[PDB]
Ligand binder design. Structure first.
Ligand SMILES: CCCCCCCC/C=C\CCCCCCCC(=O)O[C@H](COC(=O)CCCCCCCCCCCCCCC)COP(=O)(O)OC[C@@H](O)CO
Ligand SMILES: Cc1nc2ccc(NC(=O)Nc3ccnc4cccnc34)cc2o1
Ligand SMILES: Cc1nc2ccc(NC(=O)Nc3ccnc4cccnc34)cc2o1
Ligand SMILES: CCCCCCCCS[C@@H]1O[C@H](CO)[C@@H](O)[C@H](O)[C@H]1O
Ligand SMILES: CCCCCCCCS[C@@H]1O[C@H](CO)[C@@H](O)[C@H](O)[C@H]1O
Ligand SMILES: CCCCCCCCS[C@@H]1O[C@H](CO)[C@@H](O)[C@H](O)[C@H]1O
Ligand SMILES: CCCCCCCCS[C@@H]1O[C@H](CO)[C@@H](O)[C@H](O)[C@H]1O
Length: 301
């Protein structure tokens, strides 16, 4: 079990870094690949690399050693950067769907540009950095017997420190709704309307150019729906496990301590596995990204 963890964590580390760097290079090299959607997808890669590079290594040591060995300052920074990486992801996926929904379903209300996209991308970070500040405030590094901290860090853990039972129940309920259920719920309805408008609307006088627009828009909607679907599945375990632990007070009886720790461990890895999955999704569901990933691999061999 222990080596399978390190092997899986190492594979996700390499694939996510190599893949997400190629995702930025592909949009940079190809000019008429700099679409609003693909600019948001690059911002999604910038979040994934921040999680993979910085938070993932702390991820492996905590799940194996079961203790925090990086000191008090990083106990707030790293969990904060992990939380910010999640907010940036879900907000980027939300703006993508909002962009596609006004494009496919309500075509002439708002106009999306590359100039407005970079402004949204800077807004996604301004919000993600702000709303995760309370999370960093709650992070505290403390050892079993705190007098032990003067001797070693092998027995200290970095966890949330709440002053009352009610506060975590409200906090983690709001952040499950706000950052998982609500966005995915609104997005599932948006892509369903996008699905109906792309597959089914057969108005009699559609020009040959209107169809060449649809046949390409279908290929992007197919790719983006697979991305949202994998994101929902990847973050489902950690999100439900966090709510059952914090809000519902579960997983406190040490009779099933082994199964609970193996569950949360796999849930932590699944979060990073999503960072490696997305570039793979682009390779198979996007011929333009596939074409760019082809060239980057020829230069190397
Ligand atoms: C989040 C952070 C803050 C926001 C930040 C911004 C991010 C926002 C992201 C995406 C926005 C996308 C908007 C997409 C809207 C699409 C929703 C939509 O139209 O759904 C229709 C109605 O559903 C229906 O009947 C049923 C209505 C839905 C009620 C059931 C919901 C169950 C709970 C599930 C979770 C809900 C969470 C909601 C938000 C908190 C589908 O039917 P139908 O084609 O006939 O419509 C015809 C009708 O449009 C005209 O008569
Ligand atoms: C090493 C390591 N330790 C970790 C501890 C936690 C997490 N992730 C979460 O707790 N995610 C989430 C919590 C709560 N609501 C969410 C809503 C949407 C998405 N995600 C979450 C990753 C970790 O990686
Ligand atoms: C919406 C939302 N709410 C959230 C609450 C928490 C977190 N993430 C953590 O708490 N991460 C971590 C905590 C503790 N040790 C770690 C070690 C390595 C990496 N990460 C962590 C993400 C969230 O996203
Ligand atoms: C019985 C309770 C536990 C007692 C542990 C005593 C051995 C600590 S060895 C080691 O000492 C280094 C400094 O010399 C520190 O940098 C490490 O963090 C620490 O691990
Ligand atoms: C020093 C930074 C905090 C680290 C330790 C956190 C312990 C509880 S903090 C937080 O304080 C609020 C008032 O500010 C209260 O309303 C909350 O119930 C309480 O949970
Ligand atoms: C969106 C907000 C969701 C809030 C969900 C949790 C509601 C409170 S449960 C309640 O908590 C109290 C404080 O711990 C205890 O005194 C009780 O015994 C227990 O029944
Ligand atoms: C056989 C009966 C078992 C009863 C106990 C089940 C666990 C209840 S915990 C309580 O549940 C609320 C919802 O009811 C949540 O909103 C609160 O956050 C949480 O604190």
């Amino acid at each position: 079990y222990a080596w399978v963890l390190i092997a899986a964590y190492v594979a996700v580390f390499v694939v996510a870094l190599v893949g997400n760097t190629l995702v930025c290079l592909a949009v940079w090299r190809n000019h008429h690949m700099r679409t609003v959607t693909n600019y948001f997808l690059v911002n999604l890669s910038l979040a994934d690399v921040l999680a993979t590079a910085i938070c993932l290594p702390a991820s492996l040591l905590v799940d194996i050693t079961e203790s925090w060995l990086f000191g008090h300052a990083l106990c707030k920074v790293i969990p904060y950067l992990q939380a910010v990486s999640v907010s940036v992801a879900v907000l980027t996926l939300s703006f993508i769907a909002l962009d596609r929904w006004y494009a496919i379903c309500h075509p002439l209300l708002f106009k999306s540009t590359a100039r407005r996209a970079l402004g949204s991308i800077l807004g996604i970070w301004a919000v993600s950095l702000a709303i995760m500040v309370p999370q960093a405030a709650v992070m505290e590094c403390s050892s079993v017997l705190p007098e032990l901290a003067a001797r070693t860090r092998a027995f200290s853990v970095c966890d949330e420190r709440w002053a009352d039972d009610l506060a975590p129940k409200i906090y983690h309920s709001c952040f499950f709704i706000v950052t998982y259920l609500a966005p995915l719920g609104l997005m599932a309805m948006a892509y369903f309307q996008i699905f109906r408008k792309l597959w089914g609307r057969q108005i009699p006088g559609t020009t040959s150019a209107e169809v060449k627009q649809m046949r390409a828009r279908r290929k992007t909607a197919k790719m983006l729906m697979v991305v949202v679907l994998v994101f929902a599945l990847c973050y489902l375990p950690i999100s439900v496990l966090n709510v059952l632990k914090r809000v519902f007070g579960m997983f406190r009886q040490a009779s099933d301590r082994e199964a609970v720790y193996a569950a949360f461990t796999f849930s932590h890895w699944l979060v990073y596995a999503n960072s490696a999955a997305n570039p793979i999704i682009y390779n198979f569901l996007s011929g333009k990204f596939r074409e760019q990933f082809k060239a980057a691999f020829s230069w190397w061999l």
